[PDB]
Amino acid sequence: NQYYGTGRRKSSAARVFIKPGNGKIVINQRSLEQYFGRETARMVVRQPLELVDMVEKLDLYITVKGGGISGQAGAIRHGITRALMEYDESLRSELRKAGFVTRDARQVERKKVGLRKARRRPQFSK
């Protein structure tokens, strides 16, 4: 018996599995410190496990593919905040109050014609 999530940040797709346990964190068969560089990424990957009091009770299996180093952090954040709504469901009001259920609908914005970047003009003379 285990519960499941799925989250999408910028260009990533996390995939999270929750079991009751002691606190193990495995990502692509790596321990949590072996994958991520910065302590803010280790913060944001953990954040909703700290928010509710469920660090100790549960272990989790995580697979993530494609994206950047923030994409595969916000993706797992959205993944766990989905996957804990299939655990007790009265976590939902406080996760929503905390602002973790909303999937960020931001994405890279394309380059148009005659614009040297997405909105940067070229220069100007008279």
């Binding site: 560089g37 910065r38 302590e39 803010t40 913060m43 944001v44």
Partner: protein
Amino acid sequence: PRRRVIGQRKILPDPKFGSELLAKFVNILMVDGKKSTAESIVYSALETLAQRSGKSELEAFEVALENVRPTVEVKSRRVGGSTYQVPVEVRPVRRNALAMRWIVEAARKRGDKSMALRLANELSDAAENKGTAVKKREDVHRMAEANKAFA
């Protein structure tokens, strides 16, 4: 903007400590989006300062920013046929936004060998009321009393 009165946006907290004050300060140290080296330089200098002052690591910062928050400053009007400066008071947010910007504008003008040292010096000096930060503060804070006849 002309019409839409708009909101000051949210921010992540700091990685290490837990204060949303430092979230602007790690951002103002930055060039070209690399927030990691900005997160590293600041958490080195906020240990070197925390050793040199003998205070706690979070508490060596606010009581050196206190000496560089202003209280009033000028803007410009020209209502009639004459430019006036005007001493207006400053808002509680732009207070800190000016404070954390003067320090970093100063700390890229020293002669040391590293950014950590250039910011630890610049915080110890503005913790002892000397330096290119509080001298700029004296200039801004004196252009109110040189213009209090305008209001």
